[PDB]
Amino acid sequence: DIIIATKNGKVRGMNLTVFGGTVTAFLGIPYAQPPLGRLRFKKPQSLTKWSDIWNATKYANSCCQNIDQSFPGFHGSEMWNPNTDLSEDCLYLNVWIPAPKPKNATVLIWIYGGGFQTGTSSLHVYDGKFLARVERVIVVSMNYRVGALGFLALPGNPEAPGNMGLFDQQLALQWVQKNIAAFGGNPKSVTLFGESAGAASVSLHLLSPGSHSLFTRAILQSGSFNAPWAVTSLYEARNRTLNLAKLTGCSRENETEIIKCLRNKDPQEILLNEAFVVPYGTPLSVNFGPTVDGDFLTDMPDILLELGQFKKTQILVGVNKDEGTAFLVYGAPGFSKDNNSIITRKEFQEGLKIFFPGVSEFGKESILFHYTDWVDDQRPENYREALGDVVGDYNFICPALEFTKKFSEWGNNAFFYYFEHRSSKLPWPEWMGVMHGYEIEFVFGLPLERRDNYTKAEEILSRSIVKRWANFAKYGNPNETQNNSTSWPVFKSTEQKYLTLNTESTRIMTKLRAQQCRFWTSFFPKV
Ligand SMILES: *[C@@H]1O[C@H](CO)[C@@H](O[C@@H]2O[C@H](CO)[C@@H](O)[C@H](O)[C@H]2NC(C)=O)[C@H](O)[C@H]1NC(C)=O
Ligand SMILES: *[C@@H]1O[C@H](CO)[C@@H](O[C@@H]2O[C@H](CO)[C@@H](O)[C@H](O)[C@H]2NC(C)=O)[C@H](O)[C@H]1NC(C)=O
Ligand SMILES: *[C@@H]1O[C@H](CO)[C@@H](O[C@@H]2O[C@H](CO)[C@@H](O)[C@H](O)[C@H]2NC(C)=O)[C@H](O)[C@H]1NC(C)=O
Ligand SMILES: *[C@@H]1O[C@H](CO)[C@@H](O[C@@H]2O[C@H](CO)[C@@H](O)[C@H](O)[C@H]2NC(C)=O)[C@H](O)[C@H]1NC(C)=O
Ligand SMILES: *[C@@H]1O[C@H](CO)[C@@H](O[C@@H]2O[C@H](CO)[C@@H](O)[C@H](O)[C@H]2NC(C)=O)[C@H](O)[C@H]1NC(C)=O
Ligand SMILES: C#CCN1CCC[C@H](CN(CCOC)C(=O)c2ccc3ccccc3c2)C1
Ligand SMILES: *[C@@H]1O[C@H](CO[C@@H]2O[C@@H](C)[C@@H](O)[C@@H](O)[C@@H]2O)[C@@H](O)[C@H](O)[C@H]1NC(C)=O
Ligand SMILES: *[C@@H]1O[C@H](CO)[C@@H](O)[C@H](O)[C@H]1NC(C)=O
């Protein structure tokens, strides 16, 4: 029988067969009191104790969220939908352990993304059993509250203070410190990693003094807190909370009356109204997400970064080649998952209106001029590839590069990667290239499963990425082997070296997309 004693009671796990070896999996351990009823919208409350043996043998409930239903039956969109029942009782976590039980294992903690509105730890592309089997690390993932139930902000008031989802993540990190030794783990070797809004979350733990002792190192994939979609100003967050009151018949004169009204609504009543708290909106809109609450974030993150008031440790950062394409089919005209989506100069300018609603007519004309210095004039797909580049450069790549420079300027090793391989199994058309979030299967080693119809070059690439990530976690250096392997050099603000990751050749390069990023950091802010 597989039983571990925790500070909150005993828990029973389950064995899994992986690559001829055993992995011990504890799915669905509770780490906080269910935020139900009076607890809705408050910081998570520490768990007391159950008085029995909790059976952690099935993934628990994903948190309450809307569901992407644009393409019914399409794996490319539905693989991101939660594969468990939705519920407000969702603060659970999952632990994978190599067998035999390690003595002092390094812990990797996965934080899913989903624009702070969606996501669950129970998806198949987040299965952590291969990482525990192949690199003998312990893998942990937790559910956190998303959307208004996670980030409704009345700043100052303990009844809806903001960043409740980040406090959910933080409380799960506290659980790892207090309990992971009972599983074989070293709480002095904990590595946060996540993608998209999960990366943004990871980058925010580097700023929050409460998280500074709960982890060692960080990996940020396709995201950072300086991305334009990641942090709401103090009063925009408030102006959105008051609008959700009015939309649900909950406006009052007392703040706590607004909240106690909002505790009596159905979850579905709140979910259906989330999309209307904002006037404009883009495919990249984050209605309720992290904000400057004064507790977790004591100041605007860019200031804290510039002043060097953050955890000094090693980071690993990167982006995918075609980050923006995924958002084009969800709102730009002339784009469909079912053609090659070749578009005109008029449709390009309609797209720019969709993604830059408040930008002046001159700003849209400046973005157009900077992104149309064609190599070949036709090339009919020029405008299709320029719009994906605008969206990805503005929202993901130039944020990641700007965060890496400024972070490395304070004396810690940063390593930057550029993921350029499209997966043979990618359910989306070839014109969308290396999409947002499709490096993930490689990081979790899904191509290592020989029975899964991945190519031999995709197993080698993913065996290489898994090794480097596990090495970075263990030793702060993303090496593969000492011999016969490309060295990954540190990112430095002058040379700005990065490593490309693909199946042909991993190469060292310099100043990723510098001519495009120069536009977004030094000319667009003045429009
Ligand atoms: C975990 O599983 C065990 C069995 O797999 C559960 O044990 C049963 O508990 C019920 C509850 O009263 C008893 O009626 C059964 O006789 C028990 N059977 C055995 C074989 O022990 C246990 O309750 C489960 N844990 C939880 C929290 O539900
Ligand atoms: C697991 O490794 C850690 C270090 O990563 C050991 O913990 C402490 O490490 C510090 C240095 O950071 C030393 O000053 C302490 O002396 C260590 N603690 C002890 C009790 O010696 C930890 O001991 C290891 N745990 C094992 C091997 O079970
Ligand atoms: C690509 O596929 C779409 C899907 O039908 C085609 O349809 C247009 O899609 C845009 C997207 O917002 C709409 O604004 C248009 O109204 C749609 N057209 C019609 C006639 O309904 C699109 O035309 C296709 N383009 C190519 C070149 O195949
Ligand atoms: C990757 O590089 C690190 C150096 O940063 C190597 O770390 C050493 O690992 C051994 C165990 O293999 C430890 O006993 C040493 O204390 C480590 N040294 C340092 C300075 O961290 C690591 O082994 C390398 N990995 C590979 C596969 O070559
Ligand atoms: C050193 O390791 C490299 C991996 O980076 C090996 O390179 C590949 O080797 C296979 C043969 O097993 C070829 O099919 C690939 O085309 C090679 N990739 C390249 C050249 O980028 C290499 O074989 C190893 N060499 C030694 C001497 O150990
Ligand atoms: C669920 C839901 C709502 N539905 C329509 C809005 C888009 C949503 C899916 N979707 C974007 C599509 O690509 C994954 C997101 O939830 C989303 C939204 C904003 C994001 C912002 C930054 C990074 C990832 C994001 C993902 C599906
Ligand atoms: C706050 O937001 C206002 C717009 O909100 C409007 O009303 C709510 C109930 C929603 O239905 C929303 O779609 C509407 O557009 C602005 O009018 C107001 O200026 C904003 N104020 C500040 C300070 O941001
Ligand atoms: C689980 O695995 C361990 C070692 O891998 C084994 O000794 C134990 O019997 C297994 N328990 C099962 C299969 O219930």
From Swiss-Prot:
The active site is at S196, E323, H436. Changing L305P: In BCHED; expressed at very low level. GO terms for biological process: acetylcholine catabolic process; choline metabolic process; cocaine metabolic process; learning; negative regulation of cell population proliferation; negative regulation of synaptic transmission; neuroblast differentiation; peptide hormone processing. Detected in blood plasma (at protein level). Present in most cells except erythrocytes. Changing T241M: In BCHED; allele fluoride-1. Disulfide bonds join C63-C90, C250-C261, C398-C517. N-glycosylated. No other PTM detected. The major N-glycan structures are of the complex diantennary type with 1 and 2 N-acetylneuraminic acid molecules (Neu5Ac) making up approximately 33% and 47% of the total N-glycans, respectively. Only low amounts of fucosylated diantennary N-glycans are detected (approximately 2%). Triantennary N-glycans with or without fucose amount to approximately 13%, whereas 5% of the total N-glycans are of the oligomannosidic or hybrid type. Changing I97M: Does not affect enzyme activity. Changing R468W: Does not affect enzymatic activity. Glycans are attached at N15, N55, N104, N239, N254, N339, N453, N479, N483, N484. Inhibited by mercury. Inhibited by Tabun. Tabun forms a covalent adduct with Ser-196 that becomes irreversible upon aging. Changing E495V: In BCHED; allele J variant. The keyword Nucleotide-binding does not apply. The keyword Hydrolase applies. SUPFAM superfamilies: alpha/beta-Hydrolases (SSF53474). Keywords: Disease variant, Disulfide bond, Glycoprotein, Hydrolase, Phosphoprotein, Secreted, Serine esterase, Sialic acid, Signal. Tacrine binds at W80, H436. Its EC number is 3.1.1.8. Homotetramer; disulfide-linked. Dimer of dimers. This is Cholinesterase. The gene is BCHE.
